[PDB]
Design a protein around this ligand. Structure first.
Ligand SMILES: CC(C)n1cnnc1-c1cccc(N2Cc3c(CN)cccc3C2=O)n1
Ligand SMILES: CC(C)n1cnnc1-c1cccc(N2Cc3c(CN)cccc3C2=O)n1
Lengths: 289, 288
């Protein structure tokens, strides 16, 4: 990055609190020494021999996003084998931080979250970007009750891993076109984010994703099996027919039939009035008292 | 490997000449100091910090094959950070070593090689193994004109990478079924070997695979294009309708439509009664 700060970020910010980790790195709450503005600073250990392609990709993804529902990027620092990515601070943390205190979200609360995430996903997919890690831990909430997607760590890692395999596949002259296609395009597309959103709506409603108690390797085998049945909401009567249908369509098994983010934004669950940040401000009041 | 010989192979074998390298390692021609039997020894540097996964996978693939069309395995040695894989020596070398001297193979010689490779592929696929690197350089010929598939280096690397990538993929509860499918299955199957054989048949006929002159990166991009046209034999009149048809069906773009190794064994080209080792012994006579 030519815009990188070759300086210690503690010249500009006071580190206030450890916020936890992401796919990689550790996130800090920090305060601008001159303005008093709060930021989130993600510190990643970056040794001299290490491949910097994943972090280069993550900063490129963030830097070229200009949408309210994607965490804002302020800049990055490189100093003493540490790279610091400076981003928008979201005072209430993740939806997982929240629901671990408050309990299950109401259907209206889930609907507002799903609409805001779909707006961010529509934007990302309009740039040929894929989040690939949509879940409650990656959906952040600020003090105003606004929603922001975060942690492009998985997306950047896939992007760097695919580019590293490309320069090392060797002679392709005897390769089958499907092997070359998966080596260049990963074998799936942006609709994987729509499925993840459906699982996330279940997560916000039930405090855990479906099959959370099943071994992760076994969950992968069950999903790859012909005849895999998409998950559903456990309680029938507690949720509206519109919410049950939202889960049904986002959790379409075939990616060829799964609706896009833009198509999902016209679903009645997320296009209803009364969907605004005040619903999350009520959730934040429940967290406090 | 549980059967590894913890001794230096040079105590039992005399190294006679370098046979080049594989996907990794260096292959040597060696002679049994007591019996006089020839073997091929593949040497790979093994550091204590180095991952054993790929070599473990290569040895397991080799050790569990018991088929006439797959290079025989004799054992492995580990001593002073060097791993030595002991295999069947194939006196005439690879088909690439041969055609660089003899020129293009005749249709009958190619038909015979194709049948024999399909037999080894049918065996590999029945064991749930995939070669993934079928080409003239990996099809070996012994002094009897018999055919052996070799170098499971790419197969071992993919298998080890697939298993290594799983742990670094993280939690899967929010993953779409198609992402889980490419994580566990890789996004393709054993029919990739049928295509590679189709390309090999062109390579044996023309001394190069199609698009040999085109930069390797551009070839991959061309192949990924939704409208990529499977290649064909350059000369039309030189080859029978049966051979053109064998190329057409092995190079079926759609993997769901590409015939299996067992289905291909009933194709008119490779089910001809006149196919035998004598065709390659005639090719081998041309060398001496
Ligand atoms: C999702 C997060 C781990 N992350 C991974 N890569 N970038 C980010 C990222 C980017 C911007 C902001 C923030 N956070 C996190 C957070 C927590 C977390 N318990 C708790 C409280 C506030 C915040 C806040 O402002 N995080
Ligand atoms: C395919 C080869 C690179 N290889 C990679 N892993 N295992 C093998 C392997 C395994 C067994 C035998 C042999 N060879 C090679 C060879 C050449 C090569 N110009 C030339 C002459 C004879 C031979 C012979 O017996 N090689």
């Amino acid at each position: 990055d030519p815009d990188i700060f070759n300086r210690d970020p503690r010249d500009h910010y006071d580190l206030l609190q450890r916020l936890g980790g992401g796919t990689y790195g550790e996130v800090f709450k920090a305060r601008d020494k001159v303005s008093g503005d709060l930021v989130a600073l993600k510190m990643v250990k970056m040794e001299p021999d290490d491949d910097v392609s994943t972090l280069q990709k993550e900063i490129l993804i963030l830097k070229t996003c200009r949408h309210a529902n994607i965490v804002a990027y302020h800049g990055s620092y490189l100093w003493l084998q540490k790279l610091w990515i400076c981003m928008e601070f979201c005072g209430a943390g993740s939806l997982q931080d929240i629901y671990q205190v408050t309990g299950s979200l109401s259907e209206l609360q889930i609907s507002y979250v799903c609409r805001e995430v779909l707006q961010g996903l529509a934007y990302l997919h309009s740039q040929k970007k894929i989040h690939r890690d949509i879940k409650g831990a990656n959906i952040l909430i600020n003090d105003a009750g606004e929603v922001r997607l975060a942690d492009f760590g998985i997306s950047a890692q896939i992007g760097a891993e695919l580019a590293r395999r490309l320069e090392f596949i060797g002679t392709p002259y005897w390769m089958a076109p499907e092997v070359a296609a998966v080596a260049l395009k990963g074998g799936y597309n942006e609709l994987c984010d729509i499925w993840s959103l459906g699982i996330t709506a279940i997560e916000l409603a039930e405090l855990q994703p479906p099959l959370f108690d099943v071994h992760p390797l076994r969950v992968l085998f069950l999903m790859t099996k012909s005849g895999y049945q998409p998950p559903r909401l456990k309680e029938k009567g507690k949720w509206s027919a519109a919410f049950h249908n939202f889960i049904k369509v986002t959790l379409t098994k075939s990616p060829k039939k799964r609706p896009s983010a833009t198509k999902m934004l016209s679903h009645q669950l997320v296009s209803q009035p009364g969907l605004n940040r005040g619903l999350i401000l009520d959730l934040l009041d429940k967290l406090k008292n």
